[PDB]
């Protein structure tokens, strides 16, 4: 099934597959950490486990949420450094935009410009092509929410439901089986149904302090991020 | 044709799935469904046997990178 | 066989080999621990002697980034000087460019994009050092930073790198560090350096302490020498 | 969680005679959580078990309102479909669930209660969609012995009497009842 | 705009349930100079859904010829081939039921030449199965065995025939019987119709029972 | 295309894979197979109708953890206080053994 | 070869009628069903 | 940084250029797609498929419109389209800014096989993974065109590409002809990709694009549930 | 649910229409307590074996 240096390099083999990229969506389930996003009717939440395994580390700092814009919120999964360098390029791309054209930048170009850097890297043979996922949402005028999902092949595409981590295939499972129902989402049903979905995946019963949850809605669509006691209230609302 | 299926089955649901399902594992899926409809304590099937018995027995997940095509 | 000849190529299970070899490399220096205080952070650094020719100072591991910045070293020199320099570059320069000193949480960030910058390609290799950050500002506080060959950049409490690493940090888990002046706190640091590597695997070492904070008045500079010798003294009790 | 628990039922049990129904919303679920928790063999099933039944002495006993008399909500939908049969997460069943509303405590009250048409039969198919499970059929069929005696005594409407008995009894199978009583 | 076809659509259900034939070939004259108004495919799917219901309903001989002729004719002049192919399958169909010799015949023979140069081979096969019933109507049994012979030939290469399958083996049994060479032919072919034709459309099912309950009486087996 | 004296091993499969689900029906007999890695086995096997059933024994959870650690350091004559929190949260990934 | 196997396999249409000589219609059918059913694999 | 500067793409003993075959190989394993030109316009028919009911069938599109009376459809890999998209349309603006007039079919079309071929000889890059199919309407007469990997292109009548495309030409050269309308065609090029669909055949699972003598266009989600009525 | 309940108390299954499973395995990482499983059911059950 090999033929040459199609093992260790961006080539085609005999069959018409190249494993180089193959590689990047394993060595993306080396962090062992899973999050979520879901869409509602006026607002959209990504909820995502943090562990800190011992009590000399800092906990202020091992978000894996950032800030790319006040009104683009966004999520990695993978690797750190490469989700680092790549949060740093998309501030830079966002900037870039608004500067040049004048109107803040929507978030699904932005995710077609990462999805554009990022298909170069399986074009030439000389660099490895950043195995780490990516994750945004936003709000958009006459379109409402919008969530979407990136990855290193160099795709992208929008979406309803999302989830990835190491517990993909269950939770988008979950996901489907509840979306099917065709039931409208409102603020707290869409939280609870975020958090529902990984305590259901991971079988924890987590406190509130190993969860992250950010939010997005159409009353002031500047991205924010919960603090613990609202964390620990929808937690406390949603055990009867 | 020989157990219950009292009146709220759907079969036309499962046969249109996909993933070619060979001749000796569908006895399973309607054995397993039995079975669980005996834990409950209960001596007629639903349809919600059938949905988690097929969830149950099938276990394929995915193996097709959608950057393919 | 061949699949960690290049740190441009993913293994099949997906990891680089190549960083890990560095790690490895790290993992054979001596000792270096930090620990922040109430106002400020304290270093301690054991350093070998191989012969009596050497004179006393010499391959200091201690440097000064800045004028309120510190710097602790682990893993090969010639990678540390270039790093060391590198930093006080972009220091230079941030502070010619805007007009006020640099913050910890961005030189940090600097600096790890400059060392993850060499784990991308196949025409270099990636560093084989490990350092620490350490700082004190009146309307920031302490900070401490703990950067690694991979380019992974933490805020910690108390941390340790090199061989005895986890024998070290076993012993700052007993210490209480959130309340205490970094005064006596020496004392603590020393006691912890000499009840570490047994004499089996060398003959004889020596100290190196460092000091900034509120005592210091921001600069970084190193412990008075009487401080040190009554240091040692209060440490060399360990044999009871 | 037995006795004490209990206890505050019989205590209460004068509020609820001498109160209205409505009062029902804060003593459905003390139980009912305790019938949550069943972290001990028999106490759970006793609370479990007197709360459902005696639900039974609001329906009926407080007729107005309650399905005795004007049966527009309380047993023939609230505490039916609602009360524990449907859902309730998981009821216990056993002790609670057939001692309750299922058995005597409702059957019996069929017996002496409406003695009129109309609503005998809207009692008799609610109480007859909750049996439909297993590991009972000793309450449903006779109840549909009733239905029918009841339908050939007056209407006689020999061919729909005889056709709705005949699918219901498979007997041979039931292999509870007691054998001159299946014969 | 859209709310004018549904009503169209509604109007002529509500006249197909009622039990009505001169509303519906009414409507159908009327609503000529609106179909020229829309796009063609709508306008396409509308005089289908019309034509088709109104076929299908039951049989007032009076007003089907003349409609589906005027239907071919729009058709052709919309030059729409594959619609006017089904439509003049539909209207040989039409003609057997009207009891016609020749009219039925020709075009039958016409459109068999434009269906075997084109990938439709169903509609031949059906074409065959036609020209078969109506040689035999009219007492010519050989011309019928061999339109017969060329269907069945003919409908070999297709992947399944899922009901066309009983209607051909009820025809094959029916020329069978009546050249009386062996009854046991005649009923395993009626059988097969009859088990390849159940459940699915109750009207043609008791006689093909019947014919199979005849052939067995004639085995002196009653 | 195997070699010899390995052919017999796959002689006894077969007359195995006949034995159970053969052409003769088994009753009131059940078996009860293990193994830690179930890539190798021949797909014929693995089909439902003889093994119908496939049970997976994962790696302990914190609660499963802090259960085998209550378990087996019962007996031992300890002394002072315990605290199991830290024990759960450094041991990750580890096994009963 | 395939006309050998024509040619065996339409005898096998005059036994499925109980027959006892064999007609050109069985040879068509015959024809029909070898060719097209050598079309998949 | 820097490059290789090496070229990857080497001749074998026998004659031949292995990686064009790899890469066809590759392109042969995509979505199905069809292109039919009859007197009138031209039709370019593809199948899309999500994987599950989560994702949004209106967020990407199969079928691009490059300028107004262009349109370009492809079958292969995913992320090589839209880079070469990109460039075409760079392509056309230059022309237009050049000569102040709308571009020609074929000239875009050599220019995007130009690209195509020196994208196959330069020093370590591998060869692109697509396969094209582009209509156009220019003075008068239709043009319908395919592109290779290689950089070769040929015109066409009526073509299918992608996974199982033999049986797709098969069918193709039993029904086509030279003298149909748009919307015969368009009725064929659906039967004719139904012959790989899956079970059911939902408007969401079919993209079609048109392009006459006003200007290529994407059908709206009502027109092709319309048009997928009183079919099959 | 495999080996006990059927041996015992088999009009059960007969009655619902179905018949019970006859082997299972258990599969995992090295070390997680299969043959401990296997030695107490054969240690807790009055049966051949
Ligand atoms: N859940 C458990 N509770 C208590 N002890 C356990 C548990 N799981 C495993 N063990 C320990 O495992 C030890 C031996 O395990 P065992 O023989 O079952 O291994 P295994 O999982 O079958 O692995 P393998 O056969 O692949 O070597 C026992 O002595 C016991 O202490
Ligand atoms: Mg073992």
Redesign the interface.
């Given at each position: 099934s090999s033929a040459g240096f199609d093992r260790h390099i961006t080539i085609f083999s005999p069959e018409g597959r190249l494993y180089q990229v193959e590689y990047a969506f394993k060595a993306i389930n080396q962090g062992g950490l899973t999050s979520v996003a879901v869409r509602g009717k006026d607002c959209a939440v990504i909820v995502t486990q943090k562990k800190v395994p011992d009590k000399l580390l800092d906990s202020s700092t091992v978000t894996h949420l950032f800030k790319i814009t006040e009104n683009i919120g966004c999520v990695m999964t993978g690797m750190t450094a490469d989700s680092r360098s790549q949060v740093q390029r998309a501030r830079y791309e966002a900037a870039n935009w608004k500067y040049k054209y004048g109107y803040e930048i929507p978030v699904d170009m932005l995710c077609k410009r990462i999805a554009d850097i990022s298909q170069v890297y399986t074009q030439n043979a000389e660099m490895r092509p950043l195995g780490c996922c990516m994750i945004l949402i936003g709000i958009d005028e006459e379109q409402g929410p919008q969530v979407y999902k990136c990855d290193p092949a160099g795709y992208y595409c929008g979406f309803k439901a999302t989830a990835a981590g190491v517990k993909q295939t269950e939770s988008t499972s979950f996901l489907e089986k509840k979306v099917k129902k065709k039931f409208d989402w409102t603020f707290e049903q869409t939280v609870e149904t975020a958090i529902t979905c990984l305590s259901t995946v991971l079988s924890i019963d987590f406190k509130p302090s190993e969860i992250e949850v950010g939010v997005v809605t159409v009353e002031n669509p500047k991205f924010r991020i919960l603090t613990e006691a609202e964390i620990d209230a929808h937690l406390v609302a949603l055990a009867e | 044709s020989k157990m219950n299926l009292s009146e709220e089955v759907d079969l036309e649901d499962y046969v249109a799935r996909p993933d070619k399902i060979s001749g000796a594992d569908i006895n399973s899926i309607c054995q397993e469904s039995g079975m669980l409809a005996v834990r409950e304590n209960r001596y007629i099937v639903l349809a919600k046997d059938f949905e988690k018995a097929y969830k149950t027995v099938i276990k394929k997940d995915e193996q097709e990178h959608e950057f393919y095509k | 066989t061949g699949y960690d000849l290049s740190a441009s190529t993913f293994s099949p299970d997906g990891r680089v080999f190549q960083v890990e070899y560095a790690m490895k490399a790290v993992e054979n220096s001596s000792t270096a621990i930090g620990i922040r205080c109430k106002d400020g952070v304290v270093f301690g650094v054991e350093k070998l002697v191989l012969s009596k020719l050497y004179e006393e100072g010499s391959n200091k591991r201690l440097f000064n980034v800045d004028r309120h910045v510190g710097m602790a070293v682990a893993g090969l020199l010639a990678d540390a000087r270039s790093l060391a320099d590198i930093a006080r570059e972009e220091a230079s320069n941030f502070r010619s460019n805007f007009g006020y000193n640099i913050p910890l949480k961005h030189l940090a960030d600097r600096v790890a994009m400059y060392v993850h910058a060499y784990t991308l390609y196949s025409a270099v290799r990636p560093f084989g050092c490990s350092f620490m950050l350490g700082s004190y500002s009146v309307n920031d506080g302490a900070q401490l930073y703990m950067i690694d060959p991979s380019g992974v950049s933490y805020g910690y409490w108390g941390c340790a790198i090199g061989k005895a690493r986890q024998a070290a940090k076993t012993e700052i888990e007993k210490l209480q560090m959130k309340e205490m002046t970094c005064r006596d706190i020496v004392k603590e640091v020393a006691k912890i350096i000499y009840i570490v590597h047994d004499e089996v695997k060398d003959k004889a070492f020596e100290l190196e302490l460092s000091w900034v904070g509120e005592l210091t008045n921001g600069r970084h500079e190193i412990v008075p020498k009487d401080i040190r010798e009554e240091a040692e003294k209060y440490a060399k009790e360990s044999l009871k | 969680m037995a006795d004490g628990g209990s206890e505050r039922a019989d205590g209460r049990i004068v509020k609820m005679e001498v109160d209205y129904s409505a009062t029902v919303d804060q003593r459905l679920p003390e139980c009912a959580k305790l019938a949550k928790e069943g972290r001990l063999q028999e106490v759970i099933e006793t609370l479990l078990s007197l709360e459902k039944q005696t639900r039974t002495a609001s329906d009926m006993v407080s007729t107005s309102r309650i399905l005795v008399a004007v049966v527009k909500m309380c047993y023939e939908a609230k505490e039916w479909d609602l009360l524990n049969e449907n859902i309730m997460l998981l009821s216990k069943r056993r002790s609670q669930l057939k001692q309750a509303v299922a058995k005597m405590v409702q059957q019996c009250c069929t017996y002496v209660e409406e003695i009129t048409d109309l609503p005998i039969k809207l009692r008799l198919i609610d109480t007859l969609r909750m049996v439909t499970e297993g590991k009972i059929y000793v309450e449903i069929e006779r109840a549909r012995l009733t239905k029918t005696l009841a339908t050939i005594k007056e209407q006689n409407g020999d061919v729909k009497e005889a056709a709705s008995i005949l699918q219901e009894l498979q007997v041979e199978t039931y292999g509870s009842m007691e054998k001159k009583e299946r014969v | 705009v859209q709310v004018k076809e549904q009503s169209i659509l509604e109007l002529g259900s509500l006249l197909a349930k009622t039990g009505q034939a001169a509303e519906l070939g009414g409507l159908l004259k009327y609503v000529r100079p609106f179909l020229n108004s829309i796009?063609?495919?709508?306008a396409?799917?509308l005089v289908?859904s019309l034509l088709d219901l109104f076929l299908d309903m039951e049989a007032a001989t009076g007003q089907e010829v003349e409609l589906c002729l005027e239907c071919i004719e729009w058709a052709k002049s919309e030059?729409?081939?594959?619609?006017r192919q089904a439509l003049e399958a539909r209207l040989v169909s039409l003609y057997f039921d009207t009891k016609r010799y020749q009219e039925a015949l020709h075009l039958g023979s016409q459109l068999l030449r434009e269906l075997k140069k084109?990938?439709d081979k169903a509609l031949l096969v059906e074409v065959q199965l036609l020209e078969s019933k109506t040689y035999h109507a009219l007492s010519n049994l050989p011309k019928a065995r061999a339109a017969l012979?060329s269907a069945?030939?003919?409908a070999?290469?297709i992947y399944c025939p899922p009901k066309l399958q009983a209607t051909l083996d009820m025809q094959s049994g029916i020329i069978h019987a009546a050249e009386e060479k062996d009854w046991?032919?005649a009923y395993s072919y009626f059988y097969e119709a009859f088990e390849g034709y159940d459940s699915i459309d109750s009207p043609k099912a008791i006689t093909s029972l019947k014919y199979m309950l005849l052939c067995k009486i004639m085995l002196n087996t009653p | 295309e195997g070699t010899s004296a390995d052919r017999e091993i796959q002689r006894t499969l077969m007359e195995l894979l006949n034995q159970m689900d053969g052409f003769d029906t088994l009753h009131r007999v059940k078996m009860i197979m293990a193994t830690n890695r179930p890539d190798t086995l021949d797909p014929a096997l693995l089909r439902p109708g003889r093994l119908d059933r496939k049970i997976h024994i994962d790696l302990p959870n914190e609660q499963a953890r802090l259960d085998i650690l209550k378990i087996h350091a019962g007996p031992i004559t300890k002394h002072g206080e315990i605290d199991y929190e830290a024990i759960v949260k450094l041991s990750d990934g580890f096994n009963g053994a | 070869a395939e006309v050998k196997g024509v040619c065996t396999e339409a005898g096998m249409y005059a036994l499925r009628e109980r027959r006892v000589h064999v007609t050109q219609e069985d040879f068509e059918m015959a024809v029909a069903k070898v060719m097209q059913k050598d079309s998949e694999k | 940084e820097r490059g290789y500067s090496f070229s990857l793409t080497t001749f074998s003993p026998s004659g031949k250029l292995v990686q064009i075959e790899y890469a066809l190989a590759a392109v042969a394993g995509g979505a199905p797609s069809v292109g039919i030109k009859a007197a009138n316009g031209v039709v370019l028919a593809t199948e899309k498929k999500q994987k599950s009911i989560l994702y949004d069938e209106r967020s990407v599109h199969k079928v691009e419109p490059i300028t107004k009376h262009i349109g370009l459809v492809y079958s292969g890999m995913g992320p090589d389209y839209r880079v070469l998209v990109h460039r075409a349309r760079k392509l056309a603006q230059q022309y237009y800014l050049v000569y102040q007039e709308p571009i020609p079919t074929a000239q875009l079309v050599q220019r995007v096989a130009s690209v195509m071929q020196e994208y196959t000889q330069s020093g370590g890059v591998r060869p692109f993974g697509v396969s094209l199919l582009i209509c156009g309407w220019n003075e008068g007469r239709p043009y319908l065109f395919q592109s290779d990997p290689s950089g070769a292109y040929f015109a066409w009548k009526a073509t299918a590409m992608g996974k199982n495309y033999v049986n797709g030409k098969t069918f193709l050269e039993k029904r086509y002809n030279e003298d149909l309308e748009l919307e015969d065609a368009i009725h064929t090029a659906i039967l004719t990709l139904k012959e790989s669909f899956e079970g059911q055949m939902t408007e969401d699972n079919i993209e079609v694009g048109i392009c006459n003598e006003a200007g290529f266009r994407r059908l709206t989600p009502t027109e092709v549930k319309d048009y997928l009525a009183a079919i099959a | 649910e495999v080996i006990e309940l059927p041996l015992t108390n088999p009009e059960l299954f007969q009655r619902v229409g179905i018949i019970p499973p006859k082997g299972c395995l258990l599969y995992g990482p090295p070390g997680t307590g299969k043959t401990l499983l296997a030695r107490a059911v054969a240690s807790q059950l009055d049966c051949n074996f």
């Open positions: - | - | - | - | 796009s063609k495919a709508k396409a799917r289908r030059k729409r081939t594959f619609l084109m990938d012979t069945r030939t003919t070999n290469a046991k032919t | - | - | - | -």
